[PDB]
Copies of this chain bind each other. A is one copy, B any other.
Amino acid sequence: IAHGDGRRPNKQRQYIVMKACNKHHIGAEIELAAADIELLFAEKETPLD
């Protein structure tokens, strides 16, 4: 604001605010039993398999 008093008319100030990026990591663990992987690729022909 331009003022009408006797003090020093202060110049504007440009601030340079320098931010960052907070990183985060999320992970969940999933077990698969070995008797489940084994009969996934196994050849099947009977109606029970």
A1 contacts across to B, CB distance below 8 A? 28
A25:B4 contact, CB within 8 angstroms: yes
Complex Cα–Cα for A48 and B25 (A) = 40
Report the count of interface residues on A (CB-CB < 8 A).
Answer: 16
What string of 1s and 0s marks CB contacts (under 8 Å) between A9-49 and chain B? 11110000000000011111111000000000000000000
A27:B11 contact, CB within 8 angstroms: no
B27:A2 contact, CB within 8 angstroms: yes
A26 contacts across to B, CB distance below 8 A? 2-4
B29:A9 contact, CB within 8 angstroms: yes
Complex Cα–Cα for A1 and B27 (A) = 9
